Ligand binder design. Structure first.
Ligand SMILES: [Hg+2]
Length: 111
DNA sequence: ATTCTGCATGGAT
DNA sequence: TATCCATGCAGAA
């Protein structure tokens, strides 16, 4: 059958996202809009392939923030290093239709 | 000291 | 006023 890659959204890494803590923050709008919906704080494990085949597995989860939710992927440090990534570079998420498989990529900062 | 948690804050807009 | 995510910041180990 016929296949296509739908871009979902991107995230320009912050220091907090890029450093040692291992959590990459997702803006709520984007999280709820493009990832599986989730009803509990401690969310689900989420598998994302990269261009060169490799599956990564993060916990996709959130906490109560104000009267809403703040969202994150936990356990990302391996992947960031593997991709030689820093604050200011950018990660792009993307979906493959039909079937809705999640994949990812990144690019270096503008300089 | 250190890393991990689980939020809460407040700066930026 | 409001929103909200980058970073603070305390337990707990
Ligand atoms: Hg990654």
């Amino acid at each position: 059958l016929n296949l296509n890659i739908v871009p979902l959204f991107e995230k320009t890494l912050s220091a907090s996202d890029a450093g040692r803590i291992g959590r990459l923050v997702l803006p709520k709008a984007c999280a709820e809009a493009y990832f599986p919906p989730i009803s509990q704080s401690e969310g689900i494990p989420l598998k994302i392939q990269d261009v060169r085949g490799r599956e990564w597995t993060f916990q996709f989860r959130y906490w109560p923030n104000n009267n809403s939710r703040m969202y994150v992927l936990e356990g990302v440090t391996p992947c960031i290093q593997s991709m030689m990534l820093q604050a200011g570079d950018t990660v792009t998420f993307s979906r493959v239709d039909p079937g809705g498989k999640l994949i990812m990529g990144s690019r270096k900062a503008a300089n």
